[PDB]
Amino acid sequence: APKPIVDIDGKPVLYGVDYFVVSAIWGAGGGGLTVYGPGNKKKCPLSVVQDPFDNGEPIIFSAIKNVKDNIVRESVDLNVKFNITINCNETTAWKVDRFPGVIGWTVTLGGEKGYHGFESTHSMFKIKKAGLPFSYKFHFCPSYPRTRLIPCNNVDIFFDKYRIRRLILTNDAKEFVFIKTN
Numbered sequence: 001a002p003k004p005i006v007d008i009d010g011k012p013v014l015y016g017v018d019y020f021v022v023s024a025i026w027g028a029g030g031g032g033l034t035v036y037g038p039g040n041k042k043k044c045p046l047s048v049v050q051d052p053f054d055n056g057e058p059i060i061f062s063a064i065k066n067v068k069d070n071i072v073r074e075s076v077d078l079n080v081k082f083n084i085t086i087n088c089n090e091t092t093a094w095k096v097d098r099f100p101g102v103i104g105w106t107v108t109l110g111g112e113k114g115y116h117g118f119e120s121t122h123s124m125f126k127i128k129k130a131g132l133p134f135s136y137k138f139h140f141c142p143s144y145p146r147t148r149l150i151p152c153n154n155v156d157i158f159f160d161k162y163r164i165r166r167l168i169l170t171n172d173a174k175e176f177v178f179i180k181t182n
């Protein structure tokens with residue numbers, strides 16, 4: 001069985017609980033994760049973005065397959081959602097889709113929970129161990145049947161026209177740690 005994902009406190013990461021996913025670097029490399037709009041006067045939709053400093057918002061993973069002990073493990077497809085209140089017309093769940101004013105594939109909101117058919121597989125991400133102490137990365141390669149349209153790849157950050165930090169799929173990858181919210 002894939003080694004378990006661990007929070008900064010060395011305790012296992014679980015489904016159903018709030019975490020902050022924060023840059024694994026201290027005193028640098030940005031803060032944790034939030035959402036944000038086009039930067040165009042346009043308010044919506046929201047894309048997942050890294051806060052330059054603060055821990056950002058609480059995040060909840062949820063299993064694609066029932067997990068007995070409820071522990072998040074390496075390289076397993078899972079859903080991510082922010083636990084928060086948003087003003088847009090979409091769910092808080094993460095997915096990969098195109099985003100306005102951003103070239104490529106952006107991690108945005110409006111994702112699906114569970115697997116049913118292809119579309120749902122855009123909301124499946126895997127976490128995998130990374131280089132730095134306590135670090136993990138988000139990798140996208142759903143293990144469920146999907147179309148060829150979205151390339152398997154790592155998530156990193158991108159500074160777009162407005163100097164905002166988007167999440168996108170790209171060769172390189174960002175290294176985060178998980179911190180229990182409470």
Ligand SMILES: *[C@@H]1O[C@H](CO)[C@@H](O)[C@H](O)[C@H]1NC(C)=O
Pocket residue numbers: 016017018060083084
């Ligand atoms: C999500 O946030 C609410 C408060 O808005 C809180 O009551 C709850 O504990 C959090 N987590 C889950 C899993 O609902």
